[PDB]
């Protein structure tokens, strides 16, 4: 593709009229790449004109595709642009990354075929520290903490974080609210909560796979975690980093049903029944599961625990093993040690 070195940054709270390609009808969160392939001659000409002019495009996040009405959208800068001449049809391949979010003030359609709309760049504002207003002057020197010691041996890292909400929010005693309430509005403490919770859904290396900037971090997690379109629009409404993170936890603790991967339609178990008496997720009870094979207890790390192969009902894929007791006086009798990555939690409706 064509290498691009310039950076485009539209002024915040500044109205602008730009055209939007009609092929894309999905919500594109900022920081998420949206590669496509335009074949119509009008689309190719519009793409070429945009690349030569500003290498920018608009994508209105329509609540309903049929209505084609959107109250907000995202501007995309073409990071990569390529032209292909195959099968006698010109194909324009653009790998663009969303940059800004704009609210569509006025909608219009051009005569050429594309639709040009006038929108105002919504301000994705950033808030300062909640203690900046009430911080004691003498205590300012004790707010630069001592690096961030992170290790898998510490696991919970309970001791270090208990010292964070005791040196960062000491000044909370001057206000009517406690420190543990302010810790619910702390950007780094929030990013802490998403990070450790996501390590309960995948085996990713959160050290470098996730950013340190709250704004950039909030965008990609909202894109990465699987939700419906209406929820994606809802998070797009928020213009603040902390409020967006707060909404994320609600769209992340209201998804209890551990549905299968691949399936994405059947319900394996629920988060309520978690046999945490003794990696893998242990569930005391399970349903809609098929057990096959033999209770092979060889090398069974879990003693008095014989396991057999498992499948959902149709997905037929291995998602774990229902450990069975090898002794009469053994509890629990049957616990399913399902794999963390084999399930995709969804809202329990």
């Amino acid at each position: 593709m064509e290498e691009f070195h310039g950076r485009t940054l539209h002024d915040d709270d500044s109205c602008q009229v730009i055209p939007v390609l009609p092929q894309v009808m999905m919500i594109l969160i900022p920081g998420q790449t949206l590669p496509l392939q335009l074949f119509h001659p009008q689309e190719v000409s519009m793409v070429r004109n945009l690349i030569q002019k500003d290498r920018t495009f608009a994508v209105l996040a329509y609540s309903n595709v049929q209505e084609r009405e959107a109250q907000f959208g995202t501007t995309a800068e073409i990071y990569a642009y390529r032209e292909e001449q195959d099968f006698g049809i010109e194909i324009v391949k653009v790998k663009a990354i969303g940059r800004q979010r704009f609210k569509v003030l006025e909608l219009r359609t051009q005569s050429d075929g594309i639709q040009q709309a006038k929108v105002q760049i919504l301000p994705e504002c950033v808030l300062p520290s909640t203690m900046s207003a009430v911080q004691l002057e003498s205590l300012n020197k004790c707010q630069i903490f001592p690096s961030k010691p992170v290790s898998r041996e510490d696991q919970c890292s309970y001791k270090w974080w208990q010292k964070y909400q005791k040196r960062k929010f000491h000044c909370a005693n001057l206000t009517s609210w406690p420190r543990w309430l302010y810790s619910l509005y702390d950007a780094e403490t929030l990013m802490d909560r998403i990070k450790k919770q996501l390590r309960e859904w995948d085996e990713n290396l959160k050290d470098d796979s996730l950013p340190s900037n709250p704004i950039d971090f909030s965008y990609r997690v909202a894109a990465c975690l699987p939700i419906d379109d209406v929820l994606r629009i809802q998070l797009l409404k928020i213009g603040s980093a902390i409020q967006r993170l707060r909404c994320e936890l609600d769209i992340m603790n209201k998804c209890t049903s551990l549905c299968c991967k691949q399936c994405q339609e059947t319900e394996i178990t629920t988060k309520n029944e978690i046999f945490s008496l003794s990696e893998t997720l242990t569930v005391y009870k399970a349903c809609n599961l098929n057990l096959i094979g033999r209770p092979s207890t060889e090398h069974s790390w879990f003693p008095g625990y014989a396991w057999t192969v498992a499948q959902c009902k149709i997905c037929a894929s291995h998602i774990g093993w229902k450990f069975t007791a090898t002794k009469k006086d053994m509890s629990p009798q049957k616990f399913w040690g399902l794999t963390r990555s084999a399930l995709l939690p969804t809202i329990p409706d």
Partner: protein
């Protein structure tokens, strides 16, 4: 369109930095104390601090350091504002007029840049050749110091170190070098740079970078004789001088972290240190290594001087006196008795400056007396949290002060021919009676021949027929006026010691045992007039003349008052003033435009009565809890006509206009006795003797906020008032340390471990729970308590201790449903360190009756209760994000009735009538209306904006007041006349202001009289608010015409009154925020308008060269320059 008016009622009292130096004169040792927007200049004297000036600067004092450049005698003063306003002040006094002139001023804010999380740092070259400023990350702002730099033009210098903790300027260097500690991925390091002004950049430092401990936070520049820097953290104290390196790890500073320091020696041989808790260390520099002239160190021993207040900025005055400032405690003046070793604590308190501190929550109470509503705050934190009671008490202006050994009574005396004045004051000791003739300010005392040297005389006044009879325990001694010699002595018939003696114009009454004897006054002679024996012991008697129409007799063992003829014993009327205790004194005068009589007892209540002229005795039964100690009644001529003074443990003055008597407070800690005296120097004055000393003076206006403190030794959080039980309910939290043996131990005896009755909440409505991360040793657990404090004695009657991990949040006193009992209700929440958002909460309903706090209901909720209110007999609570309304059943159990689901955390709840206002910390104001017909909630309006709200308040059905980030105030408004749904469903932010303080709590009511005034008042309503620093504001609405007039007056005053630092008022009050800044609108500054009464008359004539004065209909364009003064005075009367 809001048309408000915000005015302060109490100046900020939290010291955020103090420093000494020669400022007012080249010989004095001035102490300057910044309190937030108030700069206070004191002169340090031998006996303490002498106030000099109190100057108000338009901004937040963030940096304050004195420097003396060459060519000057008195130091200048560089003051920086949190809005980045820089000025170089200089003291300038001409005989009696004092002005703080500005040598240079400017703005040092950069166009773009994130302010450093470690805050603004301001440092000055020891040689006074430059000023260093750290305002943004990686940008060191240098201000050159020259005589022609009137604009304060600075230039930036690049720092490659983004995270810099503390920067300071080293001593004794050729070029101006800086030493600082910075955080880098390797850890923490100390680096030195050399500043070159001509190069406008840094160079190689004097000594190379080193490694310090991971906590080393603050740097101290040692002076020239030693040279170098001292870096202290929490574990170690080090000294770096290049080739010299000393380090210690004392085990004393391990407990807490040192946060403030000071230098006590000109050569830097001793230093003071202060940590969080408030223990005052002392670092000593050993200068014994003078090997070859260089004064190098030998050791770095650290001493401990004992505990003090929670220190925020130490300041060592001369003669071993230390000013221990405190942001959240009381500022103190202690003395370093380095030799005493009382209990190991060298420090002894010498003075104490009051501080309303971090007001967390406040209530407005109405303990009788009509209006004059007292204000109760939960001030302080940690080991000095307290309750502050604030009133409007008239202040006593003492023209002179004389020390007395607790005189048991002072009476006037004339040492000259009668000139309608008294030039002698006769005191009364425990057994003796010292009298001193003081025509002016004389202190010499000489006993006269007519008065016994030591006879315990009680009454000594001017008798009729040119004489004076002093009644003593042994006998009454009569001395003539001009001869001044004894002429007669009519002793007691039984020669007994008269406990109570009454002296009148022409009658002398002596009470011996249960009998009394009245003698008429004869010229230079004594003649008995009547003798009688009362049924019981005479508690007190008095005669109020020539001849008293009636006399009063009191019962000591029965507390019964009888009325008998003065020259006889014929009973007239009888009454009983409760009978609790024997009366202390009685009196009768025309204070209320009628012959009203009063009787004061030793319970701190006074019984009033209405007496006719010839013969009339009414009841007028009314007992007011004036005080907590025995009283004393007196009449002072320096009043409207006579009034009445009641000395108690809170002195009160009986002020009455025509028919209503009010016990107005007197601004004094304690008054023992008082008596009028027409001294030659101060005619028609009042001499009042206190429990320790005595003063002579007069009274003044009501412009005084008397503050009484009640310590709790723990942090108070919330408070409410219960009128039925007459007690306060206050939450408190004590930090107690975990013990290795199993359990926790309290650090100090607080108000929850020293209560009368104590209970522990054993109602475990839930079991199990988890805590895999066990509570390790040394951890501090915050245990909560509910205290039931009295209202006129202030003792903890009950102290209820909640469960483990029970953070109580809300507390409301209200009566629910049809129940006649007034219930305490507390909404708690279980917090565990493992879980982020609490899941289990409780609503507990106490009923404090008969001195016991019995639980009535204990409701369990799935969440946390943040705020609670009442709806005419229903309980509205905010469980996490939901908003629940509870109906109180007849079987004493809370029953939910309706639910409204909010996507935000319902954190602030403020309701009136049927409208509900909900908000959270992110400033998302939401409105609700409760429809009784449907019995469900409805959402009326919204206002969402990312910012840090601090407190919200209802002003009216349409206007909603609330503070927000950067110490700003906003007012939202709903336009019910909007044509479309969207316009009326969105709140319009109309009012904006920059108060300059972090508002904590809002409340209704006012501290002034509730007099209707027939035609109402210019200001409609009143809302008080208390801030972190400690001020008390007042926001009141205004009319459109008044708003326009006051706005134009403010704009005219902005061009007349000069401000220190030449800061524009419109910029100071501009709505300030990190992301945007807009001018203030809809708010009228109260201080500026009130400042119209102190400027000179020509300034007024310039300000009032236009307008309409009374109204535009009457024109009066000249305005007479005085109607505006009347308007400003009427505005000032609101507080």
């Amino acid at each position: 369109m809001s048309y408000n008016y915000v005015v302060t009622a109490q100046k900020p009292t939290a010291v955020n930095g103090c420093v000494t130096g020669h400022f007012t004169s080249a010989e004095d040792l001035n102490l300057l104390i910044a309190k937030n927007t108030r700069l206070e200049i004191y002169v340090v004297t031998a006996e303490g601090l002498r106030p000099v000036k109190e100057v108000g600067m338009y901004g937040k004092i963030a940096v304050m350091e004195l420097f003396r450049p060459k060519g000057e005698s008195k130091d200048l003063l560089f003051i920086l504002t949190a809005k980045y306003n820089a000025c170089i002040l200089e003291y300038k006094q001409s005989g009696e007029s004092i002005d703080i002139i500005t040598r240079a001023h400017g703005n040092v804010q950069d166009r773009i840049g994130r302010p450093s999380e470690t805050g603004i740092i301001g440092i000055i070259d020891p040689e006074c050749r430059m000023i260093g400023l750290r305002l943004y990350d990686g940008l060191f702002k240098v201000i050159p110091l020259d005589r022609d730099n009137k604009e304060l033009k600075a230039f930036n210098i690049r720092l490659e170190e983004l995270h810099v903790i503390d920067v300071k300027f080293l001593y004794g260097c050729q070029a101006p070098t800086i030493c600082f500690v910075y955080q880098d991925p390797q850890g923490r390091h100390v680096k030195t740079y050399e500043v070159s002004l001509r190069e406008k950049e840094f160079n190689k430092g004097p000594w190379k970078q080193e490694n310090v401990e991971a906590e080393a936070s603050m740097v101290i520049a040692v002076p020239e004789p030693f040279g170098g820097a001292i870096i202290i953290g929490q574990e170690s104290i080090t000294y770096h001088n290049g080739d010299k390196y000393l380090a210690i790890a004392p085990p004393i500073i391990k407990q807490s972290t040192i946060v403030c320091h000071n230098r006590v020696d000109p050569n830097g041989s001793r230093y003071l240190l202060g940590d969080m808790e408030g223990r005052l260390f002392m670092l000593l520099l050993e200068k014994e290594e003078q090997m070859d002239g260089t004064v190098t160190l030998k050791d770095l021993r650290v001493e401990l001087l004992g505990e003090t207040s929670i220190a925020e900025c130490l300041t060592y005055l001369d003669n071993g006196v230390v000013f221990v400032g405190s942001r959240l405690g009381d500022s103190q003046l202690v003395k370093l008795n380095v030799d005493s070793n009382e209990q190991g604590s060298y420090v002894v308190a010498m003075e104490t400056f009051t501080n309303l501190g971090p007001i967390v929550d406040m209530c407005v109470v109405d303990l009788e007396r009509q209006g004059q509503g007292q204000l109760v705050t939960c001030s302080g934190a940690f080991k000095e949290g307290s309750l502050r009671i604030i009133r409007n008490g008239i202040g006593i202006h003492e023209h002179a002060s004389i020390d007395l050994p607790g005189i048991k009574g002072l009476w006037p005396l004339r040492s000259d021919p009668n000139r309608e004045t008294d030039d002698t004051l006769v005191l009364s000791f425990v057994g003796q009676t010292r009298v001193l003739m003081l025509n002016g300010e004389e202190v010499e005392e000489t006993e006269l021949m007519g008065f016994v040297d030591d006879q315990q005389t009680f009454f000594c006044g001017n008798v009729a027929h040119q004489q004076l009879i002093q009644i003593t325990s042994a006998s009454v001694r009569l001395v003539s006026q001009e001869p001044k010699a004894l002429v007669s002595e009519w002793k007691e018939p039984q020669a007994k010691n008269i406990s109570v003696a009454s002296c009148n114009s022409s009658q002398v009454v002596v009470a011996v045992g249960r009998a009394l004897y009245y003698l008429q006054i004869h010229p230079q002679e004594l003649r008995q007039i009547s003798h009688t024996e009362m049924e019981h012991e005479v508690a007190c008697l008095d005669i109020t003349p020539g001849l008293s129409p009636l006399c009063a007799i009191g019962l000591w063992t029965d507390i019964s008052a009888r009325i008998l003829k003065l020259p006889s014993f014929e009973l007239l009327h009888k009454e009983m003033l409760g009978g609790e205790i024997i009366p202390r004194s009685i009196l009768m005068t025309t204070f209320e435009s009628s012959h009203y009589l009063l009787c004061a007892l030793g319970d701190g209540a006074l019984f009033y009565f209405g007496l006719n002229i010839e013969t009339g005795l009414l009841s007028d039964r009314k007992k007011v809890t004036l005080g907590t100690q025995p009283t004393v009644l007196r009449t002072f001529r320096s009043l409207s006509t006579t009034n009445v003074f009641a000395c108690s443990d809170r002195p009160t003055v009986i002020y009455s206009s025509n028919h209503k008597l009010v016990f107005s407070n007197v601004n004094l800690k304690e008054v023992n006795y008082m008596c009028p005296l027409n001294s030659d120097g101060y005619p028609d004055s009042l001499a009042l003797a206190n429990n320790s000393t005595l003063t002579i003076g007069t009274i003044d206006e009501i412009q005084k906020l008397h503050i009484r403190t009640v310590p709790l030794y723990e942090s108070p959080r919330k408070i409410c008032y219960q009128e039925v039980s007459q007690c306060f309910g206050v939450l408190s939290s004590r930090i107690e340390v975990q013990d290795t043996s199993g359990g926790t131990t309290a650090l100090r005896p607080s108000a929850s471990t020293q209560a009368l009755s104590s209970s522990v909440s054993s109602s475990k409505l839930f079991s199990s729970s988890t805590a895999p991360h066990e509570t390790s040793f040394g951890e501090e657990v915050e245990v909560h308590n509910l205290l039931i404090i009295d209202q006129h004695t202030f003792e903890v009657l009950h102290a209820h201790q909640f469960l483990q991990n029970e953070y109580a949040l809300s507390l409301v006193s209200c009566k629910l449903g049809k129940d006649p009992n007034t219930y305490f209700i507390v909404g708690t929440a279980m917090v565990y360190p493992e879980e982020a958002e609490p899941k289990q909460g409780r609503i507990v309903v106490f009923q404090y009756s008969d001195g016991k706090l019995q639980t009535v209901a204990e409701k369990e909720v799935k969440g946390a209760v943040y705020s609670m209110v009442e709806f005419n007999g229903k309980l509205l609570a905010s469980i996490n994000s939901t908003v629940r309304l509870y109906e109180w059943t007849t079987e004493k159990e809370l029953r939910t009735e309706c639910n409204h689901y909010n996507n935000i955390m319902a954190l602030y709840l403020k309701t009136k009538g049927d409208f509900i206002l909900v908000g959270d910390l992110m400033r998302s104001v939401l409105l609700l209306a409760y429809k009784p017909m449907e019995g469900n909630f409805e959402e009326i309006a919204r206002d969402f904006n990312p910012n840090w709200m601090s407190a919200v308040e209802i002003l009216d059905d349409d206007n909603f007041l609330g503070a927000e980030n950067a110490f700003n105030l906003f007012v939202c408004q709903k336009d019910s006349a909007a044509t479309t749904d969207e316009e009326r469903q969105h709140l319009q932010e109309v009012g904006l202001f920059h108060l300059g303080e972090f508002v904590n709590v809002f409340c209704h009511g006012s501290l002034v009289m509730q007099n209707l005034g027939e035609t109402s008042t210019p200001t409609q309503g009143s809302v008080l608010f208390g801030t972190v620093n400690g001020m008390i504001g007042l926001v009141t609405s205004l009319s459109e015409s008044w708003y326009n007039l006051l706005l134009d007056m403010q704009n005219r005053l902005n061009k007349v009154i000069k401000s220190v630092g030449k800061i524009e008022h419109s910029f100071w009050r501009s709505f300030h925020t990190e992301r945007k800044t807009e001018p203030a609108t809809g708010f009228i500054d109260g201080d500026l308008i009130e400042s119209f009464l102190d400027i000179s008359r020509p300034k007024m004539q310039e300000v009032v060269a236009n307008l309409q004065y009374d109204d535009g209909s009457g024109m009066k364009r000249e305005a007479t320059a005085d109607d505006l003064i009347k308007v400003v005075e009427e505005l000032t009367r609101i507080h």
